[PDB]
Symmetry: C3
Subunit: 159 residues, 3 copies
């Protein structure tokens, strides 16, 4: 048995891993069956609804349909940071800042890197920023997400 705060932060870490893998099943497994994710536009401190995802199936579909799939040699990193945690009994609230970066790996030349090529080859770009607010509750073996709010600080377009 580890500290509740660590178990809760572990859930957040598993969330980012699933996010960057675009793994709907790993993502959904972190939530209570009936949990909702409210995604909102927080530019200028607004609270305009982008999408409300009700239940695990809705979450699974959104992992595919609401963010770009990774094309060849692409990845992402969801840099969650500055967590604030308040635990009161069997419920907790976690607020974290987040910033998502796109990662695009250069193709490795068949003839090798030319003389004078050093360091990472590719592009890393910050592509989203905002805050997560998670409500968690206990389960027998740890903690699960019972509700989540995603606040975006850039406008989000869907094609």
């Amino acid at each position: 048995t580890m500290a509740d705060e660590t178990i809760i932060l572990n859930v957040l870490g598993q969330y980012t891993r699933a996010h960057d893998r675009r793994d709907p099943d790993a993502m959904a497994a972190l939530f209570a069956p009936e949990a909702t994710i409210e995604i909102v536009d927080a530019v200028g401190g607004a609270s305009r609804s982008i999408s409300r995802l009700e239940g695990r199936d809705a979450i699974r579909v959104a992992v595919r349909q609401m963010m770009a799939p990774h094309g060849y040699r692409a990845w992402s990193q969801n840099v969650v940071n500055a967590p604030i945690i308040v635990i009161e009994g069997d419920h907790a609230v976690l607020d974290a800042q987040f910033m998502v970066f796109s990662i695009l790996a250069a193709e490795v030349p068949d003839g090798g890197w030319p003389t004078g090529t050093f360091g990472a080859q590719g592009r890393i770009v910050p592509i989203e920023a905002g805050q997560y607010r998670l409500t968690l509750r206990t389960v027998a073996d740890g903690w699960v997400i019972s509700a989540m709010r995603i606040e975006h600080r850039l406008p989000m377009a869907f094609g």
Copy 2:
């Protein structure tokens, strides 16, 4: 009652929230009345004074006068990371890396995003980097900042 380390990390998280909101009163409330912030130039491992802020009023004014206000649809994210915490009784020292990013949201067109527009619209740029060193002490309900050092790893200009 939560672990002291969590309460201390919660203070750091409230600091970043106040920083990015440019909220002088939320910022000042995290400090003991008489606390000082020493802001220093650490480029090349120097320790050249930029500003010494003595007491809450000085801190409040600096929130406005030492960093850019957010113009329309602008925000920031203070990405604190890699904390090291040492608690000895009723005092603690916390060292964190920090990197501040500017966020500028694009204006949403009245006619909507044109067909083929996907993802976040705007610009995110890393604009400061360094380390924070906080000295904290206990109060009845938790922990407060009794002293802080801000080390910048880029030169800072003030107009």
Copy 3:
């Protein structure tokens, strides 16, 4: 005595400090004498070996020979984030996302910044991204790294 999770996260923080200082001795001191670092190419979920560093001397040399030295007024920040920690008795595993940024400070003009110059002067660029997986074990005074895996999500070139 602090919580084991804090002591373990403190090791990670000392790792980033040593990394950014390019301090081989501070880095090596975090590892058991016989520890290995496996550095691997994880682009596309591969696991292709880049380098295997066996023991402290190998680690010390790699701090110099496997990443760029800091030239004048240069620095870096190793932004570790989203840790997941599992402790089972006297062993622990820690997985963290990481992103390294290069920092290049502008030279300060002898005549001072021209009128209208505001904010940080220089360049901050994301230059590496991936995951760290550390195995730690107890020692009398805390925890040491017994094995480490570094997974890079960009191809790495060595000249």
